[PDB]
Amino acid sequence: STHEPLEVLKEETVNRHRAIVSVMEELEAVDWYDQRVDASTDPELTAILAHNRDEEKEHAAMTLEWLRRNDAKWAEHLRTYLFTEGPITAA
Amino acid sequence: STHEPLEVLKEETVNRHRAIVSVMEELEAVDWYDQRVDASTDPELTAILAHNRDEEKEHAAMTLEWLRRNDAKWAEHLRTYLFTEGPITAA
Amino acid sequence: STHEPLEVLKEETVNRHRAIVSVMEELEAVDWYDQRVDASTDPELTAILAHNRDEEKEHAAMTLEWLRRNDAKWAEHLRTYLFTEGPITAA
Amino acid sequence: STHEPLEVLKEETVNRHRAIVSVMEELEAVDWYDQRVDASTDPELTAILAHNRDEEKEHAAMTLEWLRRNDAKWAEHLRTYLFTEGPITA
Amino acid sequence: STHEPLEVLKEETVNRHRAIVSVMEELEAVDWYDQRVDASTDPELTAILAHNRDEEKEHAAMTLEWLRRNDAKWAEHLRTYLFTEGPITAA
Amino acid sequence: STHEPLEVLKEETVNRHRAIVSVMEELEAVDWYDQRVDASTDPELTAILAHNRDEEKEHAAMTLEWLRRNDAKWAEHLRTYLFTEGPITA
Amino acid sequence: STHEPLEVLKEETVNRHRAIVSVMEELEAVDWYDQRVDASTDPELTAILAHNRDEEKEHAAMTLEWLRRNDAKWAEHLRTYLFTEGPITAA
Amino acid sequence: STHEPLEVLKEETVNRHRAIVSVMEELEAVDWYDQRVDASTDPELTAILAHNRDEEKEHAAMTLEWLRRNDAKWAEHLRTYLFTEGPITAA
Amino acid sequence: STHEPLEVLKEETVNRHRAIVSVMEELEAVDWYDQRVDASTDPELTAILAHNRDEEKEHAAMTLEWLRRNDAKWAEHLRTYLFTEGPITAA
Amino acid sequence: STHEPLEVLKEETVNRHRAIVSVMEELEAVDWYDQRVDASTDPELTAILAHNRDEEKEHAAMTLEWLRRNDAKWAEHLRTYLFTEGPITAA
Ligand SMILES: [Ca+2]
Ligand SMILES: [Ca+2]
Ligand SMILES: [Ca+2]
Ligand SMILES: [Ca+2]
Ligand SMILES: [Ca+2]
Ligand SMILES: [Ca+2]
Ligand SMILES: [Ca+2]
Ligand SMILES: [Ca+2]
Ligand SMILES: [Ca+2]
Ligand SMILES: [Ca+2]
Ligand SMILES: [Ca+2]
Ligand SMILES: [Fe+3]
Ligand SMILES: [Fe+3]
Ligand SMILES: [Fe+3]
Ligand SMILES: [Fe+3]
Ligand SMILES: [Fe+3]
Ligand SMILES: [Fe+3]
Ligand SMILES: [Fe+3]
Ligand SMILES: [Fe+3]
Ligand SMILES: [Fe+3]
Ligand SMILES: [Fe+3]
């Protein structure tokens, strides 16, 4: 699932790939579940969709913390913007 | 680009969809660029790919902070795991 | 996200569609996470990937149980095969 | 059809992959068929579509049972929720 | 799932479409299952795969007979070639 | 275009794959052409579309006979339903 | 199957779209069948594949003639290059 | 980009594949551009789109002539139908 | 082809969408033709592929110029980097 | 991610491939972000989307300048059309 041949990729690059596509898949699941929660017309299904939705956010956060500990630029930019106040574009 | 009809989705659900697919696309770009950075055999191109790569991480971080500010469970789970030490699964 | 126009689909068909597509996506996440667990060369990442993997199995089982309660034929066939011993093809 | 090279995957991982994608494909067929059953305006076709639909559930159930027998946490989590009463999120 | 808008398609064209895509999907399942049957290294799984495989052929055959009964050229061409002997291109 | 590596597939399996994918593509063309025939507002084009459509059916029927001759379960199930009368789900 | 909404498209444009996509699908079948013909290890199947292959070329040629009759620039460029000798880039 | 492994394909088959997929891509560009021409509400863009469209037809015709010179059935079938008069299905 | 409903998109956004997607498709064609030029083993075909390739670049440049003239930020950023000589990341 | 096998492609072809798909992805991001800016009903999100949008144009422009410096026909055709006056077609 990589775009370049594995023999020219550094191991750390490939591990970061694994982490990044995981976050991508978690975000997609968050998004789809939230849409299904709004549209669902069954209360028992809605409670299940909403529970799964919010656990995906936890999955994403864990993997994003791993990216942060293993990439100086993820560390730098996440530190600049996360948990701030005032206009996000002026930080 | 939504899986459910727009008329049954809450406004904040659609705006979070816009933000979430944006973060997904930034992540994809990070990964793609980093792979091309490893495989490139032209250092002038490599310099452009790496420059672009790291700005995508900033675009992702900005959008993630917006999500964090506009979604309680994103705020909760990001607070739990980001900028921690020790085992990520037990934070 | 349906193959037929929503206005000819019964309400229950559309809810089962939401549940079915959720189980599909969970199964896919299990499989992909398990492959990344095998291939990962970073122990902290591996711990995270395996943690998320097993929670997707729980998201799936919760949704399958909803399908079972809301579809007589799922109930019948799941009852026949799940939690049995001996040859599966002979139950 | 795997995302990681086969030489780094354990045999058991690959067999579970085969089962898992089988279940996915059965689920998809159940959903597709059910929608076509609702939309179809020919009763003879509808009968075929519905027949096929419910046999895919059986295909899915059989494959899922194998998965369950060959993966400890599938077995654990399915045991928690399947054939229960009261709120599923509990 | 139609290539043309439903509002210009005749009802019977749309029903034949439902049948054709059904057969297409069955054929795909037969093929994927057979490939998994050859590659599987667990005999209990292999037996299930083979079982499912052969029932997809029956799903296809039922739907093909519906097409034969509802389309005169399907009827003509299936009668010319199916269950014949000697060279297929010379029937 | 196979989901499993070629080195573990039997030769006959790969040939059936060639046949099956051919039939799938013929069916897709039949369907696509029939929709275009319905939507077309040019009679000369429609005539071409309809002609091509019905020849795809012949392409499919030929390849389907090859499968019937080379796969016992295709022979069995095709024989149960094809050229029959009364309700198909029986 | 169009990229723009049908009500902004001229009728004739939509009919040329039907013809063009038909030719595209015929070309694809020609290519795939030809590849299957080279790879097949069953002579009887190969004869069916080659027979079908060459009839796709006729389906394509027929539809292409309609295009030529209904589009002045198709007529111009097909006239310039088809059935010529010497270097194609110098026709 | 081939469906069969390159080692079982004849060189000529692969060159024909390169030409066929080129024509397919040209036809797709012709169609897409023609749709954007009808839909555009900017005349300067429209003139560019129309210009590109008609040059794609030329690219297709050139490549189609190469196929004709390198494939007996293309030569046969193109000769039968192109630049004819009266009903196309009857040449 | 758009990701948001057309009725919420400004007319100029939609026209820029048409141009942007045209450039993307032109770039794609340049890349694929260039790959086919390298791999082709028939010199007559290679000459056609190379000719078409280089015309796609002209199609892209024309459309890129339309974007330059109709979008302030494209104009600003293209002006900064196009037709320069020093190291690209420092302009 | 190439359509031809890497061992038949020149090094320069593959690096141009890396730049071109990068430009394509940048163009796609510009378009998607621009559509989201129009549709967004959250002004704080809109400002992030617009910021990111315009930085993608800069990423594209850098990469495009690299292509211009490494491909004689890109340089020739870009020089013909960019930053010109009068009708784009007649330049
Ligand atoms: Ca997913
Ligand atoms: Ca992208
Ligand atoms: Ca390992
Ligand atoms: Ca059975
Ligand atoms: Ca399927
Ligand atoms: Ca049965
Ligand atoms: Ca096709
Ligand atoms: Ca009509
Ligand atoms: Ca294209
Ligand atoms: Ca200068
Ligand atoms: Ca250079
Ligand atoms: Fe998850
Ligand atoms: Fe970005
Ligand atoms: Fe999940
Ligand atoms: Fe099935
Ligand atoms: Fe089936
Ligand atoms: Fe055909
Ligand atoms: Fe055909
Ligand atoms: Fe072209
Ligand atoms: Fe072009
Ligand atoms: Fe970018």
What backbone torsions phi and psi does residue I47 show, to the nearest 5 degrees? -65, -35
Between CA D66 and CA I27 the distance in angstroms is 48
What is the secondary structure of J25-89 as a DSSP string? HHHHHHHHHHHHHHH---HHHHHHHHHHHHHHHHHHHHHHHHHHHT-HHHHHHHHHHTT--S-ST
Q: What is the DSSP letter of D83?
A: T
Lookup: tokens for J72: 């004689």
What backbone torsions phi and psi does residue F85 show, to the nearest 5 degrees? -130, 175
Query: Please, do chains B and F touch (3+ CB pairs < 8 Å)?
Result: no
User: Are H36 and I49 within 8 A, CB to CB?
Assistant: no
What backbone torsions phi and psi does residue E86 show, to the nearest 5 degrees? 65, 180
Enter the CATH code of domain D1-90: 6.10.140.1960
C1 touches chain B (CB under 8 A): yes
Between CA F48 and CA G58 the distance in angstroms is 11
- Overall resolution, Å: 2.1
* 8 A C-beta contact, residue H73 and residue G54: yes
Give the distance (Å) from ligand 21 centre to CA of residue J58. 8
Which among F31, F83, F80 is positioned nearest to F53, based on CA atoms? F31
Q: Is I28 annotated as a binding residue?
A: yes
User: Are F32 and G25 within 8 A, CB to CB?
Assistant: yes
* 8 A C-beta contact, residue C3 and residue D35: yes
Written as one letter, the residue type at J84 is T
User: Are F41 and G11 within 8 A, CB to CB?
Assistant: yes
Q: What is the DSSP letter of J4?
A: S
Q: Is E3 annotated as a binding residue?
A: no
Question: For the CA atoms of I10, I15, I19, I25, what is the dihedral angle to 10 degrees?
Answer: 80
User: Are H83 and G79 within 8 A, CB to CB?
Assistant: yes
Q: What residues of G are in contact with residue F36 (Cβ under 8 Å)? A: 18, 22
Between CA G82 and CA G88 the distance in angstroms is 9
H-helix or E-strand spanning residue I53: helix I43-70
User: Are H16 and G28 within 8 A, CB to CB?
Assistant: no
* 8 A C-beta contact, residue C57 and residue C2: no
| DSSP 3-state of A82 | coil
Written as one letter, the residue type at D62 is M
Written as one letter, the residue type at F19 is A
Q: Match 């093909």 to its residue by tokens.
A: E64
Least CA distance to A19: which residue of chain B? B31
Lookup: tokens for B9: 């989705």
Residues annotated within the binding site of B are 25-26, 28, 56, 59
* 8 A C-beta contact, residue C25 and residue A29: yes
Which among B91, B32, B23 is positioned nearest to B58, based on CA atoms? B23
Substitution target from B1, B80, B89 for chain C, most C beta carbons within 10 A: B89
* 8 A C-beta contact, residue I35 and residue J17: yes
Between CA E58 and CA E65 the distance in angstroms is 11
Between CA I39 and CA J10 the distance in angstroms is 9
CA angle J62, J65, J71 (to 5 degrees): 145
* 8 A C-beta contact, residue G20 and residue H27: yes
Written as one letter, the residue type at B83 is F
Q: What residues of B are in contact with residue I89 (Cβ under 8 Å)? A: 47-48, 51
- Nearest C-alpha of chain A: how many angstroms from J11? 14
Q: How was this structure determined?
A: X-ray
Query: Residue I6: which residues within 8 A CB-CB, separation 6 or more?
Result: G5, I14
Beta strands in H11-91 (DSSP E): none
Q: What residues of B are in contact with residue I87 (Cβ under 8 Å)? A: 44, 47
Of the candidates J27, J53, J77, which has its C-beta nearest I61's C-beta?
J77
- Alpha-carbon separation of residue D28 from C14, D22, E29 (angstroms): 13, 10, 11
Which among D33, A7, A72 is positioned nearest to E18, based on CA atoms? D33
Between CA C17 and CA C14 the distance in angstroms is 5
Q: What residues of F are in contact with residue H5 (Cβ under 8 Å)? A: 6
Between CA B49 and CA F13 the distance in angstroms is 44
Between CA G44 and CA B56 the distance in angstroms is 55
Between CA I26 and CA H48 the distance in angstroms is 13
Task: Give the helix ranges, DSSP H, for chain A.
Answer: 11-39, 43-69, 72-81
Query: Please, do chains B and H touch (3+ CB pairs < 8 Å)?
Result: no
Residue spans of the domains in chain F: they are 1-90
Between CA A91 and CA A81 the distance in angstroms is 7
Residues 21-80 of E with CB under 8 A from C: 44, 47-48, 51
Between CA B52 and CA B58 the distance in angstroms is 10
User: Are H60 and G77 within 8 A, CB to CB?
Assistant: yes
CATH topology of domain G1-91: Helix Hairpins (6.10.140)
Q: Is H44 annotated as a binding residue?
A: no
Written as one letter, the residue type at G49 is L
Q: Is E57 left (phi over 0), alpha (psi -120 to 50) or beta?
A: alpha
- Alpha-carbon separation of residue H67 from C64, H17, H44 (angstroms): 54, 10, 36
- Nearest C-alpha of chain F: how many angstroms from H3? 5
Beta strands in F1-90 (DSSP E): none
Substitution target from F4, F48, F53 for chain H, most H beta carbons within 10 A: F48
Give the distance (Å) from ligand 9 centre to CA of residue I22. 9
Which among B37, H9, I37 is positioned nearest to J10, based on CA atoms? I37
Lookup: tokens for A90: 């002026």
What backbone torsions phi and psi does residue A69 show, to the nearest 5 degrees? -70, -15
